[PDB]
């Protein structure tokens, strides 16, 4: 059970990675110049909604 | 005007709280049902066994009654 209890949550978690950078898992998002790309407008509404549940 | 990512507070999700709570059974209450089911169990079962005795003697009576067999 617990493997599939949290992997539905985990597949929803990779959507935050996909929306912030073009790759699913491993992304060159963190760089020596701080952060590569800005947070899009459809993330901060999603992070708060995800953390609440 | 430049638009960026906005902050949202409201309730702040409420982090770290015990959601686990005891339900239905307490301890002493379930034992009263447990032994109560046992007391009801044995009493109802032995009444059928006494009812079986009515059949038991009557079934073996057939062999005693039939001697031309």
């Amino acid at each position: 059970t617990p493997f599939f209890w949290m992997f539905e949550e985990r597949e929803k978690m990779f959507e935050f990675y996909e929306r912030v950078s073009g790759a699913r898992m491993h992304a060159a998002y963190v760089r020596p110049g701080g952060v590569h790309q800005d947070l899009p407008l459809g993330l901060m509404d999603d992070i708060y909604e995800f953390s609440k549940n | 005007x430049x638009x960026x990512x906005x902050x949202x507070x409201x309730x702040x999700x409420x982090x770290x709280x015990x959601x686990x709570x005891x339900x239905x059974x307490x301890g002493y209450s379930m034992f009263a049902v447990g032994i109560g089911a046992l007391l009801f169990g044995y009493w109802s079962m032995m009444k059928w066994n006494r009812e079986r005795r009515r059949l038991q003697i009557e079934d073996f009576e057939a062999r005693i009654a039939l001697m031309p067999l």
Side-chain angles (χ1 to χ4, degrees), chain B residues 8-66:
Chain B
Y28 291 93
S29 60
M30 206 174 181
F31 269 89
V33 187
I35 309 153
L38 287 154
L39 285 154
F40 183 79
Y42 301 128
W43 185 81
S44 59
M45 198 71 188
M46 292 297 178
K47 283 178 86 72
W48 182 255
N49 289 297
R50 288 182 193 90
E51 205 76 63
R52 190 168 275 184
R53 298 295 200 280
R54 314 279 181 271
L55 311 157
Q56 199 187 306
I57 310 156
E58 210 161 303
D59 287 320
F60 280 88
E61 195 72 40
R63 202 210 185 272
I64 313 154
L66 295 163

Side-chain angles (χ1 to χ4, degrees), chain A residues 39-41 44-45 48 51-52, chain B residues 4-6 9-13:
Chain A
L39 294 154
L41 288 157
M44 287 289 279
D45 292 298
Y48 178 76
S51 59
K52 202 175 184 73

Side-chain angles (χ1 to χ4, degrees), chain A:
Chain A
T1 35
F3 185 79
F4 309 102
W5 267 75
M6 293 285 101
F7 258 72
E8 181 57 49
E9 184 276 340
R10 194 175 172 167
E11 209 81 72
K12 285 161 187 157
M13 256 288 302
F14 278 109
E15 288 179 63
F16 296 95
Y17 281 86
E18 280 175 294
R19 206 159 282 183
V20 88
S21 189
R24 176 84 79 170
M25 291 175 80
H26 325 106
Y29 182 76
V30 182
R31 288 181 201 186
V35 166
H36 161 64
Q37 213 164 301
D38 67 296
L39 294 154
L41 288 157
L43 269 186
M44 287 289 279
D45 292 298
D46 283 59
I47 296 151
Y48 178 76
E49 203 176 302
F50 195 80
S51 59
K52 202 175 184 73
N53 295 307

